[PDB]
Design brief:
The structure is cut from a larger assembly and holds chains A (46 residues) and B (45 residues). Chain A is mostly helical and 46 residues long. Chain A is built from two helices and no strands. Chain B has no helices and no strands. Classes of the chains: A mainly alpha (46), B little secondary structure (45). Chains A and B meet through helix 2 of A and loops of B. It is classed as immune system.
């Protein structure tokens, strides 16, 4: 008899306060923990 | 046997026991962080 249990839960809540570009950094957190350099520069310009 | 009378008795018994336990595992952990500041908005890259 063999039994295996797998359980992994990872949740992120980015806060990017760039009015329209604020949602980009929040949506990019899905599977991408590191922030995009180009997206970060765009948010800084915003 | 003495002489008619004959007697013979044979006995045999063996035992064996073995135990083998092996456990090997490794755990590693490493954390790295950074902090910086920059004193236009283009330089934020």
């Amino acid at each position: 008899a063999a039994s295996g249990t797998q359980n992994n839960v990872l949740r992120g809540e980015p806060f990017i306060r760039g009015a329209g570009f604020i949602s980009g950094l929040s949506y990019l957190e899905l599977d991408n923990p590191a922030g995009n350099k180009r997206r970060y520069s765009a948010w800084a310009e915003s | 046997r003495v002489l008619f009378a004959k007697k013979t008795k044979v006995e045999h018994r063996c035992t064996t026991n073995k135990l083998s336990e092996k456990h090997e595992g490794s755990f590693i952990q490493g954390a790295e962080k950074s902090i910086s500041l920059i004193r236009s908005e283009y330089g934020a890259a």
